[PDB]
Amino acid sequence: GMPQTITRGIKAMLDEANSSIETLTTADAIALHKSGASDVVIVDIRDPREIERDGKIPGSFSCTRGMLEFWIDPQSPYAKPIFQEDKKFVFYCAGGLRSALAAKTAQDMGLKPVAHIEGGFGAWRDAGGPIE
Ligand code: NA
Structure with missing residues (x-):
């Protein structure tokens, strides 16, 4: 049968995202973490099975990408107060x-x-960044 036709893919989505956000270099992120990451929350959005296999950035907060909006929004029944903090979210x-x-x-x-x-964590690991 005729396949699905995808007219907006990850390339378009990633371009839009990349040009609107801060991409922190792996080295800068590692240095930030070593400094104590004051006024920063590092958010791990991976599936828990990825985290189990590969480890994580110490002190990171786990919120899977698919739950993000529901935990960020203070008007969500599932709101998490960490996302209301006056900090940079990495x-x-x-x-x-x-x-x-x-x-x-x-x-x-x-x-x-x-x-x-x-x-991501792949580059973090390759650079020998802190891992739990
Ligand atoms: Na950018």
Whole structure:
């Protein structure tokens, strides 16, 4: 049968996100973490099975990407108070792509300031960043 026709793909979504958000270099993110990450919340948006396999950034807060809006919005029944804090929110995933979309979503909602980690946890690990 005729296949599905995708007319808006990840390329378009990622371009829109990337040009609107801070992409924090892996090295800068690692340095930020080592400084104590004052007034920063590092948000791990990976599936828990990814986290179990590969580990995580120490002290990061887990919120899967698919739940993000529901935990950010204070008017959501599922609101998490951490997202109301007067801090910079740095999102990360495995390779940097989901987290660009997540940062853009959060920014679109009004969360400010936001960023994501270039190359994700994969790049973090490759650089020898802190891992739990
Ligand atoms: Na950018």
